[PDB]
């Protein structure tokens, strides 16, 4: 489009979160419009088009549930949907509900300011648009600002330079190239086996080794799909009533109580079945360091037995941090890749990168000559997208400033001093610790219900109570401190961005309990919010 001067609700972001908000707000009888930087819908599945890109949550879980028609119609094809497929899904939903007529594309919001006189937001874009809106919904993502390390050589590299979160829209040809991949999180583990098949030589620059387990992907049986469809709302209600927003089995035992022989036998069953459910095999894997370590060691042994050169294998073995505290990764022929002659593991812990050079990468041991260099170096997560926008609350406080020692929220949904502003599936909430379609739908519903409630009662200003926000922040840190999550440098704590404050940013109590807390809050008239 071309955006309206005035609107009840402005939404930023046209991925999963913004599309649903735009959908539900129209149903609720509210004027609403979306501004999005990308050329089209999809959010992470529009930007992340690198080869091998693929979801780690089963296709049947990772999908919308607000529309029965969508659930009956869509045909998923495999256990874990590839990126192109998930993008076809999102295009399908966008077409079905005519969503694009409410979205300005190619447009980046740059500043937003709350106006105490009118109880409204004024939102500016990089095209010179100015929009006035009663409420502001930031659906701008969790993993939406690419993080490029500030390596000394970078702007001098004479080859082709890429980042997996901003991938060309036409396939890139690596045939006969020497190619370097920096980063071995889920992006790098998924991209490298694809590049390994085209490149003359592939150098995988690893820092901390991450734990990954086999995906065991497979065709989805069309019979099973037809069968699921008969009870689809029931199946999703079951997933909503869990810590993780999926059908993972919640292992009741402690990893410490079991004999060696029972532990091997349980873990081996998880490993053969494939997928991430091993994380919840015993109740204390994320709570107790001796529990965690008996599982970790099982995993490190599978890695040693997968790679034939034991020197290379040992370099791949994760050390230094508890299993499950960086995101657990699903791999498809990633370890086996290192048995190819043309694939090299460069351990940068023992040989740190000193600089990028015109021809390649220099570590303390040698220089590597490369035609292309792929950064799988992640995202300035959870706060990176909000921080790129000049957002100003009451008394002209900048959000960037209030949150400079870490995000401060009530329920993650709002921050005090910034009335009428909501963050979708961000810091202070379950967010990426659960299936994100479950986190996102529940936030979009709770916020849009809240906005409908304000118009219904002729209220115009919603603001979190400062003391409740402070209590909520404290609570989030205290329950996080009963787990091993804060022990490790991950994007969850911000420790991947130099200078970023190190605080575990997510609610760890599980989706289900959080959902309960949010319903209790709404049921009592939005206790902990002041409305006028």
Ligand X SMILES: Cc1cc2nc3c(=O)[nH]c(=O)nc-3n(C[C@H](O)[C@H](O)[C@H](O)COP(=O)(O)OP(=O)(O)OC[C@H]3O[C@@H](n4cnc5c(N)ncnc54)[C@H](O)[C@@H]3O)c2cc1C
Ligand Y SMILES: NC(=O)c1ccc[n+]([C@@H]2O[C@H](COP(=O)([O-])OP(=O)(O)OC[C@H]3O[C@@H](n4cnc5c(N)ncnc54)[C@H](OP(=O)(O)O)[C@@H]3O)[C@@H](O)[C@H]2O)c1
Q: Indicate the annotated binding residues for FAD.
A: 17, 36, 44-47, 56, 62, 109, 142, 436
Work out whether 504 is an interface residue with ligand X (CB under 6 A).
Answer: no
Which one of 32-40, 225-233, 346-354, 522-530 is the stretch in contact with ligand X (CB under 6 A)? 32-40
| Three-class secondary structure assignment of 302-343 | HHHCCCCCHHHHHHHCCCCCCCCCCCCEEECCHHHHCCCCCE
Residues in contact with 197: Cβ distance below 8 Å, sequence separation at least 6, in sequence order: none
Choose between 44 and 476: whose C-beta lies nearer to ligand X. Answer: 44
Please choose which of ligand X, ligand Y, none residue 13 contacts, taking the beta carbon within 5 to 8 angstroms, the exact cut-off set by kind. ligand X
Number of separate helices (H) and strands (E) present in the chain: 16, 20
CA 485 – CA 208 distance, rounded (Å):
16
Q: State the DSSP code for 75.
A: -
Residues 25 to 64 in contact with ligand Y, rule: CB under 6 A: 54-56
Are 198 and 340 contacting, i.e. CB atoms less than 8 angstroms apart? no
Site string for ligand X, 118-147 (x = CB under 6 A): ---------------------xxxxxx---
Work out whether 48 is an interface residue with ligand X (CB under 6 A).
Answer: yes
CA 46 – CA 379 distance, rounded (Å):
16
Residues in contact with 362: Cβ distance below 8 Å, sequence separation at least 6, in sequence order: 153, 353, 354, 355, 356, 368
Q: Which of 36, 347, 371, 441 binds ligand X (CB under 6 A)?
A: 36
Q: How far is CA 380 from CA 212, 233, 312, 490, 505, in A?
A: 22, 35, 30, 11, 13
Work out whether 55 is an interface residue with ligand X (CB under 6 A).
Answer: yes
Residues in the chain: 532
Structure tokens at 282: 């015993």
Residues in contact with 527: Cβ distance below 8 Å, sequence separation at least 6, in sequence order: 520, 521
CB of 65 to ligand X, least distance (A): 14
Site string for ligand Y, 115-154 (x = CB under 6 A): ----------------------------x-----x-----
Residues 417 to 436 in contact with ligand X, rule: CB under 6 A: 424-425, 432, 435-436
Q: How many residues form the binding site for ligand Y (CB under 6 A)? A: 24
CA 231 – CA 315 distance, rounded (Å):
47
Nearest residue to ligand X, scored by beta-carbon proximity: 43
CB of 373 to ligand X, least distance (A): 19
Choose between 97 and 423: whose C-beta lies nearer to ligand Y. Answer: 423
Q: State the DSSP code for 146.
A: B
Work out whether 303 is an interface residue with ligand Y (CB under 6 A).
Answer: no
Are 25 and 2 contacting, i.e. CB atoms less than 8 angstroms apart? no
Which one of 29-37, 183-191, 337-345, 354-362 is the stretch in contact with ligand Y (CB under 6 A)? 183-191
Site string for ligand X, 199-238 (x = CB under 6 A): ----------------------------------------
Are 34 and 140 contacting, i.e. CB atoms less than 8 angstroms apart? no
Choose between 133 and 436: whose C-beta lies nearer to ligand X. Answer: 436
Residues 430 to 459 in contact with ligand Y, rule: CB under 6 A: 432
Work out whether 389 is an interface residue with ligand X (CB under 6 A).
Answer: yes
Q: Which of 194, 198, 208, 254 binds ligand Y (CB under 6 A)?
A: 208
Work out whether 79 is an interface residue with ligand Y (CB under 6 A).
Answer: no
Please choose which of ligand Y, ligand X, none residue 377 contacts, taking the beta carbon within 5 to 8 angstroms, the exact cut-off set by kind. ligand Y
| Known binding residues for NADP(+) | 54-56, 184-190, 207-208, 326-327, 491
Work out whether 493 is an interface residue with ligand X (CB under 6 A).
Answer: no
Give the number of other Cβ atoms within 10 Å of residue 312's Cβ: 16
CA 477 – CA 465 distance, rounded (Å):
19
Choose between 20 and 335: whose C-beta lies nearer to ligand X. Answer: 20
CA 12 – CA 113 distance, rounded (Å):
14
Q: How many residues form the binding site for ligand X (CB under 6 A)? A: 35
Please choose which of ligand X, ligand Y, none residue 496 contacts, taking the beta carbon within 5 to 8 angstroms, the exact cut-off set by kind. ligand Y
Work out whether 505 is an interface residue with ligand Y (CB under 6 A).
Answer: no
Choose between 56 and 333: whose C-beta lies nearer to ligand X. Answer: 56
Q: b/e map of 28-56 (b: 16 or more CB within 10 Å)?
A: bebebbbbbbbeebbbbbbbbbbbbbbbb
Q: State the residues that interact with ligand Y by CB under 6 A.
A: 54-56, 143, 149, 182-188, 190, 207-208, 327, 348, 376-379, 432, 491, 496
Residues at the contact surface with ligand X, assessed by CB under 6 A: 12-18, 35-38, 43-44, 48, 53, 55-57, 108-109, 139-144, 385, 388-389, 424-425, 432, 435-436, 440
């Amino acid at each position: 489009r071309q955006p309206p001067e005035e609107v009840d609700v402005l939404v930023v972001g046209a991925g999963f979160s913004g599309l649903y908000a735009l959908y539900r707000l129209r149903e609720l009888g509210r004027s609403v419009h979306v501004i999005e930087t990308a050329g089209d819908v999809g959010g992470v599945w529009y930007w992340n088009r690198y080869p091998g890109a693929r979801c780690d949550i089963e296709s049947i879980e990772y999908c919308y549930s607000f529309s029965e028609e969508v659930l009956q119609e869509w045909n998923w094809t495999e256990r874990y949907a590839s990126q192109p497929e998930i993008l076809r899904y999102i295009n399908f939903v966008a077409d079905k509900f005519d969503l694009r007529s409410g979205i300005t594309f190619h447009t980046t919001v740059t500043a937003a300011a709350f106006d105490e006189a009118t109880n409204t937001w004024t939102v500016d874009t990089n095209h010179g648009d100015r929009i006035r809106a009663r409420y502001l919904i930031m659906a701008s993502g969790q993993l939406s600002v690419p993080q490029l390390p500030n390596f000394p050589g970078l702007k001098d590299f004479a080859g082709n330079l890429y980042h997996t979160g901003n991938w060309p829209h036409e396939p890139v040809d690596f045939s006969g190239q020497r190619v370097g991949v920096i980063g071995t999180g889920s992006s790098g583990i998924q991209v490298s086996p694809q590049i390994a098949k085209q490149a003359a030589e592939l150098f995988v620059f690893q820092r901390t080794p991450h734990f990954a387990v086999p995906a065991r992907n497979a065709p989805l049986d069309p019979e099973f799909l037809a069968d699921l469809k008969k009870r689809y709302a029931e199946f999703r209600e079951e997933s909503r009533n869990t810590p993780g927003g999926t059908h993972r089995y919640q292992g009741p035992k402690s990893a410490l109580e079991v004999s060696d022989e029972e532990l091997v036998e349980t873990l081996e069953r998880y490993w053969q079945e494939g997928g991430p459910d091993i994380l919840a095999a015993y109740r204390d894997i994320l709570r107790d360091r001796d529990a965690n370590e008996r599982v970790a060691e099982f995993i490190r042994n599978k890695i040693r037995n997968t790679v034939r050169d034991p020197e290379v294998a040992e370099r791949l073995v994760p050390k230094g941090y508890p299993f499950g505290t960086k995101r657990l990764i699903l791999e498809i022929d990633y370890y086996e890749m290192f048995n190819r002659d043309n694939v090299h593991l460069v351990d940068t812990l023992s040989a740190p990168i000193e600089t990028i050079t015109p021809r390649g990468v220099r570590t303390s041991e040698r220089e590597y000559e490369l035609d292309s260099l792929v950064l799988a170096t992640g995202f300035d997560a959870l706060t990176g997208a909000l921080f790129k926008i000049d957002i100003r609350g009451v008394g002209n406080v900048a959000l960037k400033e209030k949150w400079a020692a870490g995000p401060r929220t009530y329920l993650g949904l709002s921050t005090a001093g910034f009335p009428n502003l909501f963050f979708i599936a961000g810091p202070g909430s379950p967010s990426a610790l659960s299936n994100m379609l479950v986190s996102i739908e529940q936030h979009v519903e709770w916020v849009t219900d809240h906005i409908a409630y304000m118009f219904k009662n002729g209220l115009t200003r919603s603001e979190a109570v400062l003391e409740k926000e402070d209590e909520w922040v404290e609570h989030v840190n205290e329950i996080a401190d009963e787990t091993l999550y804060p022990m490790t440098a991950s994007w969850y704590t911000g420790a991947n961005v130099p200078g970023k404050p190190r605080v575990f940013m997510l609610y760890v109590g599980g989706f289900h309990r959080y959902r309960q807390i949010c319903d209790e809050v709404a049921a009592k008239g939005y206790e902990g919010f002041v409305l006028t």
